[PDB]
Amino acid sequence: SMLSSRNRVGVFEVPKQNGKYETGQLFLHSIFGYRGVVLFPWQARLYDRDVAVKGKTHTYYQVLIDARDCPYAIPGLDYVSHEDILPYTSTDQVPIQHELFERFLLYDQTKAPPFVARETLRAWQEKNHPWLELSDVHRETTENIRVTVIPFYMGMRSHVYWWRYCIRLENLDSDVVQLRERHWRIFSLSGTLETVRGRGVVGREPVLSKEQPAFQYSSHVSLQASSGHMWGTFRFERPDGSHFDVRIPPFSLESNKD
Ligand code: NA
C-alpha cells in the first residue's frame, strides 16, 4: 500500500538518460517519495495502450523500501520503473533500514554506488530473474486516471496457482476523484469465469487529487489452472455527483514460458 503525501539526507544525482541504474543505488520514489535501494535491473515488456499493443522492452528494478517510510512476497520488496527513481548519494554505511539490506549489500568506499552484491544477492537475482520473465507491464488511461498493472507468479499447491499484482492509480488532472468499487473479471484456461464486485481496494477508497495524485496497492488472485487473463474496471466518484469506470487493461497470469 502507498498514497502520496510528503517526504522530509544525501546529495541528489541527475536521473540517467542513456544508462540503467546499478545495484546499491539509493533513490527516492519520484511518486511515493520513499527512501529505497536498487537490487537489480530487469527488462519487462510494457503494453502501454495510450500510444494512440506492440509491447516495447522497458527497464524495471526490484528494490528494498526503507522501513521508516513503510510499516517472493517480502514486506519492503517492490518494483519501480527507471522513471520512478530520483537517484541520490549518502555516506551513512546504513542508508536504508530493512532486514534484507546487509544480507544483499557489502559497504565498500572503493566504488559508486558504494554497496556491492554479497553473492547472497547474485543467487537471489538468479532465482527471481526467471519468474520475472512471466511479468509483463500493462497501462491504460481513462478520463485522466492512469492504471499500471504487473502480475507476479508466486507458485502453486487439487492443483491451485497463486499470483500477486501491483496496481498503481494516478490522477493526471486537477479534478478530485475517489475509488469506490472494483469489478474484476478473472477468466481461467479451464473456461471458468469468476467475477468480483466490491467496495474499495484492500480496504481503501483512495482520494486522488494533485495534492495526493497517486495510489499503489498489491493483492493476489488464485486459479485452479496453469494460466488465465484478468481485467476489470474501478468506479470513481466526482464531487459534482458523477461517476466513471476506469478500465484495468487486460493482463495475463502464467506458469510456463514455452
Ligand atoms: Na560503479
Residue numbers in the entry: 49 to 56, 65 to 108, 126 to 144, 168 to 253, 258 to 358
Structure paper excerpt:
7 , 8 POLDIP2 stimulates Polδ by increasing its binding to PCNA, a homotrimeric ring‐shaped processivity factor for DNA synthesis, 7 potentially by bridging the molecules, with the POLDIP2 NTD required for full stimulation.
The YccV‐like α1 helix leads immediately into a presumed “linker” region between the YccV and DUF525 domains, comprising the α2/310 helix (residues 201–230). Instead, we propose this region is part of an extended YccV (E‐YccV) domain. β0 hydrogen bonds with the distal β15 strand of the upper β‐sheet, thereby connecting DUF525 to the N‐terminal region. During structural refinement we observed that Cys266 exhibited electron density that could not be accounted for, either by alternative rotamers or by surrounding residues (green). Protein mass spectrometry also confirmed the expected molecular weight, furthermore, a mass difference reflecting the size of the density was not observed (not shown).
